Structure formats: C-alpha cells, structure tokens
Amino acid sequence: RRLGVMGGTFDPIHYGHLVAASEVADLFDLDEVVFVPSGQPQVSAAEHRYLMTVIATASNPRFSVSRVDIDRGGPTYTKDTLADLHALHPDSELYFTTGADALASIMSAQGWEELFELARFVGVSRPGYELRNEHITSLLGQLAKDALTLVEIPALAISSTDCRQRAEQSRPLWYLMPDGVVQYVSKCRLYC
Amino acid sequence: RRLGVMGGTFDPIHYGHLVAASEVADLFDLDEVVFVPSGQGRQVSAAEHRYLMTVIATASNPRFSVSRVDIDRGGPTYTKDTLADLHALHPDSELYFTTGADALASIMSAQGWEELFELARFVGVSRPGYELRNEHITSLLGQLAKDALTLVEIPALAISSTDCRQRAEQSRPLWYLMPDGVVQYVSKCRLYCG
C-alpha cells in the first residue's frame, strides 16, 4: 500500500497543488495522498493554511490532511514529518512530494540518509525546470538514484505567489483554486 | 453593457480557458463573457460534444454563458460572422472578442481585418513562453504598435487542450485541470478514444 505525502506551505493552496497530487498518485499508483501543511513560517497562520487545505481536498476521497507538522513545534523538518507519518502508517510506503526547489534544500541537510530510509521522494515543478536548473536536477538525480523522481506539472504555472498578489490587487482568483478557497481567502482577508 | 466573446474550439474546455475569461472580464470591466465554440485538426470532437462541455464548465458562473451561433451557422467559422450575429443579439453592447494569441494572429493576418475593428475590440490570450510561428509574431506586432489589439498573459493557459486530450487517451487523470463535470463528460462519451 503506497501513501503520498505532499509537504507544502499551501498559502494559498491552488489547482497546481491539486493537479500535482493527482499526477503523482497516478504515476506511482498511490492509494492516498496526505496533504501536510508545514508548521514553520510573512506566512499566514497555520490554521488558515490548514483550513484552506481541508476545503480544497475535502471532496476527494483519495486526499486527506494531516496536522503533524502544524501541531509538532516551531521548525518543520521533513525527517520529523516522515517519522510521525511512519508511526501513523507503518503499513504504508511513503512517497514524499514537494517543490523541486525545496527538495534540493531538504536533501542538502544533515541526516539526508535518514530520509531515504523513511521514504521515496518526488520533486514537482512547473515546465522547463531542468533547463533553468540543470545542475540541481543533475545533483538530485545522482544522489538519490532511483529513490527520487522529478516530474513536471504544467498546472504549476499557477503559483501561491501570484495568487497572493492577485488577492492584494483585488484581481479575481476564480478557477485558479476551488471557490471554497477563494471565499476563505476573502472572508478572512488573508492577504490585505 | 460591455460583452466579452470567447472564441475557441474548447476540445476540451479547461481551467486555462476559464481563468483567461475571468482575467479578461476583470481587465476590461466586462459585464458578461459569452463562450462561442467554433463550427465543425486531425479530428475535432462533434460540435454538440464541445458545446455541452462548455455548458457544463461555465454553468455555475452567472457571468459566463454559451452561444451556438458558430455551431448552428454552417461548416467553417469566420469571426466576422460571429461578431455579426452577436451584435444583432446584443445591439446595446460593445463586443470584446477574445481568443488564443496564435488564433488572433491568424485572424488579423487574413484579408479584411479592417472590417473587424468596427465590430469589436480584440484580446489575445497566451500561456507564458508560447512559441508562435513567425508570420504570427509579425502580424501581432504590427497591430500592437498601432495599439489596435491587446495581449494578456495567462499562467493557467499552461494547461492546454492538446495535453488534456493525450492524458485522456493514455488514461492519465484530468482531475483539477478542468471541472469534474467536463472530466466525466469526456469519459462518459469516450471523446478521445477513451
């Protein structure tokens, strides 16, 4: 039984995140994808980010949201995320998924060997990421061997950064994310 | 009332189309965007299929609607016909024709574009880094330096109809690339070889 773990800030979550989750679940025949909003940060309150993710993933039986990073403590380390989730899901083979840029930083930290005993890794990026970052890709691939995969997601052209700025400038967020998330951003006035 | 006109094949329609329509409606304070599937590529889905997908996808939005003027008129679609018909249906309205930047280039590069500008204003939408042909770049540039045409960039148009079709052919998920209703419609009707 294979379990996907998508680690992100989700500030806000959008269709790029959701497409990426579906793609990864299909490419590796995952039975479920657990969305884990990170604790550590500026960044919206963890509850806002948690609720937005609950709203966006609710209607999908194969998506779920975990509070392991939010509840644990100050700074979020992927080794912690995987440790907690390994305990909750000892059955499951973990496929940790996040931005290719974040993954580069995560693998470059102390105890990266500890990471490979806990999970397989999937870096996601918007199109043409290997051209702009040919060395990060080259180093990631070579360190992890076939314990890591980089996949390109056209929909990740949608970014949390653009979403936030559209909200700041009162430009519509329709069809970039579920209406529920759009309204949540509005109702809580998340980005001024 | 300022009326948006989204001309496309919509085979299939997706969030890229919908984001672009939303953006253009906001940029030009449009009161409504009318989606017009073209009449009728190796094969293109039947017009009714493309119409229903567009109806499904735009339904929940009070400011979107779908027209059959191109579908019903005849075989091949001319924008001048589309603009003629919709002006008759909305004589009050100032028409804002919106389509793919590549398509807009072609429309402008064919005889009688001068005939078009009296009927509507034009908006080309494109995905970032979109590699147009050269005769299209030249055609857009000329109109751009005269400020007779507007181009807006839509990150969400990185989602394309071609990739959706291929994902459907290869039984790869279309979730969150388009509304579930359109996802299911493609499936239920087996639109791209299942």
* Rounded alpha-carbon distances, angstroms, from residue A167 to A12, A124, B37, B80, B169: 10, 25, 31, 37, 36
**Hey, how many other C-beta atoms are within 10 angstroms of the C-beta on A61?**
7
Mutate to test the interface with A, among B18, B130, B176, B184 (most CBs of A within 10 A): B176
Q: Please give, one letter per residue, the 3-state secondary structure of B97-125.
A: EEEEHHHHHHHHCCCCHHHHCCCCEEEEE
CATH class of residue range B1-194: alpha beta
Question: B142-156 as b/e, with b when 16 or more CB fall inside 10 Å?
Answer: ebeeeeebbebebbb
In the numeric block, which tokens belong to residue A108? 């470059």
* Rounded alpha-carbon distances, angstroms, from residue A78 to A29, A30, A87, A138: 22, 20, 14, 22
Cα distance between residue B121 and residue B5, in whole Å: 10
What is the widest separation between alpha-carbon atoms in chain B? 47
Cα distance between residue B100 and residue B125, in whole Å: 5
Q: What is the dihedral of CA B155, A15, A147, A71, to 10 degrees?
A: 130
Q: Do A175 and B156 touch (CB under 8 A)?
A: yes
| Kind plus residue range of the DSSP H or E element containing B185 | helix B180-188
In the numeric block, which tokens belong to residue B141? 């540039």
In the numeric block, which tokens belong to residue B10? 């919509």
Contact A100, A125 (CB under 8 A): yes
Question: A134-156 as b/e, with b when 16 or more CB fall inside 10 Å?
Answer: eebbeebeeebeeebbbbbbbbb
Mutate to test the interface with B, among A158, A175, A177, A183 (most CBs of B within 10 A): A175
Residue located via tokens 């055609």: B139
Name B150's Cβ contacts closer than 8 Å, sequence gap at least 6.
Answer: B121, B122, B123, B124
Q: Find out whether the peptide bond into A37 is cis, omega within 30 degrees of 0.
A: no
Residue B18 near chain A (CB below 8 Å): yes
| Closest residue, chain B, to A126 (C-alpha) | B158
**Resolution number, Å:** 2.4
Determine the distance in angstroms separating the CA of B18 from the nearest CA of chain A, rounded to an integer.
6
Nearest CA to A95 out of A190, A179, A3 is that of: A3
Q: What is the three-class DSSP state of B164?
A: helix
In the numeric block, which tokens belong to residue B12? 């299939």
CA within 13 Å, CB half, B32: 15
Beta bridge partners of B123: B98, B150
Contact A150, A178 (CB under 8 A): no
Nearest CA to A55 out of A182, A180, A139 is that of: A180
Nearest CA to A134 out of A150, A115, A154, A145 is that of: A150
| Kind plus residue range of the DSSP H or E element containing B72 | helix B69-73
Indicate the pairing of strand B2-8 with strand B32-37. parallel
Q: Do A171 and B23 touch (CB under 8 A)?
A: yes
Instruction: Determine the number of helices (DSSP H) and then strands (DSSP E) in chain A.
Output: 10, 6
Helices of type H across chain A: 15-27, 46-57, 68-72, 78-88, 100-107, 112-116, 129-132, 134-144, 160-168, 179-187
Domain ranges of chain A: 1-192
| Closest residue, chain A, to B128 (C-alpha) | A157
- What φ, ψ does residue B49 adopt, rounded to 5°? -60, -50
CATH fold of the domain at A1-192 = Rossmann fold (3.40.50)
DSSP B190: T
Give the distance from CA A133 to its chain's centroid. Answer: 20
Strand order in the sheet with A93-99: A63-65, A32-37, A2-8, A93-99, A120-125, A148-152
**Hey, how many other C-beta atoms are within 10 angstroms of the C-beta on A105?**
12
- What φ, ψ does residue A76 adopt, rounded to 5°? -95, 120
Give the distance from CA A189 to its chain's centroid. Answer: 23
- What φ, ψ does residue B139 adopt, rounded to 5°? -70, -40
Q: Do B158 and A162 touch (CB under 8 A)?
A: no
Contact A10, A163 (CB under 8 A): no
Cα-Cα-Cα-Cα dihedral sign, residues A101, A106, A109, A113: negative
Q: A-chain residues within 8 Å CB-CB of B163? A: 154
Angle B111-B135-B127 from CA coordinates, rounded to 5° = 110
DSSP A134: H
Cα distance between residue B85 and residue B116, in whole Å: 13
